[PDB]
Amino acid sequence: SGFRKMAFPSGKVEGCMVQVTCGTTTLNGLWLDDVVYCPRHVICTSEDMLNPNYEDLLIRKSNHNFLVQAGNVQLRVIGHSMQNCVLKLKVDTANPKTPKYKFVRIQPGQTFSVLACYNGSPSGVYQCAMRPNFTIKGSFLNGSCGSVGFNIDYDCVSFCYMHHMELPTGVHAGTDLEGNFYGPFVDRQTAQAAGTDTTITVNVLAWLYAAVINGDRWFLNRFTTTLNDFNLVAMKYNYEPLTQDHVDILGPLSAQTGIAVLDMCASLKELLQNGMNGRTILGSALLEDEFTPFDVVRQCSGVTF
Amino acid sequence: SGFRKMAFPSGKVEGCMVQVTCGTTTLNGLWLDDVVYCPRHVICTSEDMLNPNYEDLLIRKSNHNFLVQAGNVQLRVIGHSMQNCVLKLKVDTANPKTPKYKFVRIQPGQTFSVLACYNGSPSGVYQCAMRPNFTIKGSFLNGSCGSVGFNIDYDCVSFCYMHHMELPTGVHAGTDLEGNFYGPFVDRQTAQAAGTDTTITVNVLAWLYAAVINGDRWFLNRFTTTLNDFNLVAMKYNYEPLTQDHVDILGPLSAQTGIAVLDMCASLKELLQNGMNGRTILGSALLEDEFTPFDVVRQCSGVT
Numbered sequence: 001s002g003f004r005k006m007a008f009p010s011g012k013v014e015g016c017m018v019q020v021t022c023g024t025t026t027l028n029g030l031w032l033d034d035v036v037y038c039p040r041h042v043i044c045t046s047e048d049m050l051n052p053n054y055e056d057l058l059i060r061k062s063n064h065n066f067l068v069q070a071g072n073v074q075l076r077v078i079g080h081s082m083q084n085c086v087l088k089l090k091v092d093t094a095n096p097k098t099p100k101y102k103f104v105r106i107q108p109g110q111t112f113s114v115l116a117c118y119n120g121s122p123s124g125v126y127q128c129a130m131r132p133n134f135t136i137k138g139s140f141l142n143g144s145c146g147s148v149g150f151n152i153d154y155d156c157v158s159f160c161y162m163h164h165m166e167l168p169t170g171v172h173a174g175t176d177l178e179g180n181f182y183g184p185f186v187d188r189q190t191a192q193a194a195g196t197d198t199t200i201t202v203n204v205l206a207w208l209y210a211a212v213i214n215g216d217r218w219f220l221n222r223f224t225t226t227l228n229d230f231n232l233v234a235m236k237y238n239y240e241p242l243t244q245d246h247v248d249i250l251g252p253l254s255a256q257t258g259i260a261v262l263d264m265c266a267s268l269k270e271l272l273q274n275g276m277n278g279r280t281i282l283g284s285a286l287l288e289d290e291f292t293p294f295d296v297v298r299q300c301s302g303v304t305f
Numbered sequence: 306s307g308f309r310k311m312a313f314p315s316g317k318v319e320g321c322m323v324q325v326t327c328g329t330t331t332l333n334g335l336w337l338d339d340v341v342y343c344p345r346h347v348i349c350t351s352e353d354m355l356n357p358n359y360e361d362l363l364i365r366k367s368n369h370n371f372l373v374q375a376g377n378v379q380l381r382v383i384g385h386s387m388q389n390c391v392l393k394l395k396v397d398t399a400n401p402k403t404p405k406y407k408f409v410r411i412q413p414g415q416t417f418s419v420l421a422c423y424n425g426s427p428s429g430v431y432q433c434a435m436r437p438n439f440t441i442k443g444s445f446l447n448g449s450c451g452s453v454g455f456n457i458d459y460d461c462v463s464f465c466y467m468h469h470m471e472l473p474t475g476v477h478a479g480t481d482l483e484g485n486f487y488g489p490f491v492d493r494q495t496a497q498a499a500g501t502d503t504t505i506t507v508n509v510l511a512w513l514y515a516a517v518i519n520g521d522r523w524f525l526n527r528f529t530t531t532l533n534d535f536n537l538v539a540m541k542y543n544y545e546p547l548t549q550d551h552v553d554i555l556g557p558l559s560a561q562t563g564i565a566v567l568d569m570c571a572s573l574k575e576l577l578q579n580g581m582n583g584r585t586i587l588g589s590a591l592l593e594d595e596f597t598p599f600d601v602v603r604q605c606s607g608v609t
């Protein structure tokens with residue numbers, strides 16, 4: 001029983017983390033086979049970040065200016081390239097602890113485990129959701145860049161996020177491992193503000209199913225509704241619209257509990273309009289939306305890797 | 306910026322988790338050097354658990370009955386002993402991946418990271434607090450006994466918990482790595498109920514400090530309360546008493562915040578009586594008590 005915000009085992013990623021230094025700037029990198037990936041603003045001065053010509057400043061440097069270090073071992077850079085906002089440094093040695101991996105671009109609403117690192121050393125791991133505004137509400141301090149987010153798809157480590165920048169709101173923004181930013185953000189010190197956020201309704205429903213699997217039933221009424229009557233209510237509370245594909249993905253939890261998706265949509269409807277009656281659900285007094293439907297199955301089914 | 310309940314990196318512990326099978330019963334074990342630790346009731350059948358006698362039940366068994374698996378490699382068991390409620394299995398080979406480790410017994414109120422495992426394979430990692438009633442509100446399914454909790458002191462993995470049992474409440478109970486249960490629980494199918502629980506006052510305060518460092522300051526007030534007076538409001542609301550040892554350990558965050566421990570005790574005291582004013586604190590409408598004062602520094606000081 002029980003239900004906690006659960007991260008994937010971080011062992012396979014810990015083995016790929018290294019330190020990348022260029023001039024006076026250091027940050028983290030991901031060492032897979034004989035290539036190290038890291039944010040390309042490692043090659044930038046603070047002066048450069050006001051208007052950075054990454055194409056020009058990349059070729060102005062060469063392999064010797066990059067100091068990659070895997071723990072205590074120095075790795076010899078033998079080639080440097082640029083794929084969007086991610087700098088690829090070819091190295092002399094291939095990582096023996098390289099897992100079977102894949103580079104994936106997640107969609108807003110999905111989750112992943114973040115391994116926060118500093119100077120190429122892991123500090124801690126936690127679960128993050130990619131908000132609808134393409135930010136993540138993470139925990140990062142300076143030097144955390146190159147920290148990556150990932151999922152473990154059965155026998156494969158799917159990397160989905162590399163951290164680049166903190167915004168003024170305190171939220172965070174990054175890229176996929178192809179170097180493409182999630183959201184309308186820039187690796188440039190220019191005015192950037194996240195867009196208005198919304199609540200991932202499909203994830204909240206999944207989290208109510210999880211509460212039912214763990215005994216909590218006080219919020220379940222004898223009502224049901226239509227998918228559009230609920231969405232009318234959802235829009236009023238700045239909730240993401242629920243699609244038919246969303247209802248499809250909640251089937252497995254609807255099947256496990258014997259509660260139709262729209263039956264619980266009605267339960268959520270009245271949780272939004274009349275509050276939570278000063279009661280707790282899985283140890284929270286607010287509606288949690290950082291659990292995907294697969295996150296609930298994974299935790300309440302004992303999936304292993 | 307930001308504050309989430311993050312766990313320690315699990316890599317070092319992952320290498321130590323194996324699958325222990327005796328008869329029809331399979332659970333997880335910890336493989337350190339040439340020894341595999343696991344909950345002793347692996348030797349029992351469900352019919353035995355109603356009134357097991359472990360010393361005689363081990364009298365019945367041999368090293369031949371204990372099957373250990375490190376991934377897909379089978380480890381030869383060459384000896385089996387028992388220390389309190391933990392079974393120690395001596396094996397033919399030592400774990401190449403044994404970290405510098407300690408066995409520690411935590412006190413109620415401190416936190417640790419749990420690596421939930423099944424069939425010797427890790428499934429997830431999360432943070433827990435040892436409640437004042439010596440329970441933990443974790444996430445454990447069947448075949449999760451053997452899973453272990455741990456901290457990471459720089460480069461020393463100090464194990465402090467092994468999972469053994471879930472109680473009717475839904476909470477969880479286990480032992481330190483010397484086989485001694487936390488709380489008045491036992492590995493037997495007997496009437497056992499978790500004592501009624503209290504909130505960890507010192508952790509809530511640390512959590513409030515984390516909230517202001519991260520920018521949340523609406524709960525502030527500072528009406529000048531005394532340690533005692535606070536404690537008398539606290540105990541009525543089922544919060545554990547706040548000693549001045551606690552005040553001492555909140556010193557660091559009282560410093561960086563410039564907020565005297567007692568003046569936040571004040572703003573906690575009326576948060577306790579008035580309410581949350583329908584507002585949040587780091588994304589919670591509840592007072593969070595599963596963050597130690599060190600947990601708050603470690604997460605605000607970038608420790609690795």
Ligand SMILES: *CC(=O)[C@H](CCCNC(=N)N)NC(=O)[C@H](Cc1ccccc1)NC(=O)[C@H](N)Cc1ccccc1
Pocket residue numbers: 025026027041049141142143144145146163164165166167168186187188189190191192
């Ligand atoms: C991940 C990092 O911390 C990295 C600094 C590495 C050097 N190591 C240490 N200082 N210990 N990068 C940044 O800190 C990042 C650089 C950047 C600037 C502009 C865009 C993208 C990246 N700095 C920030 O993100 C600041 N918050 C500046 C900023 C950026 C965007 C909007 C508003 C402010």
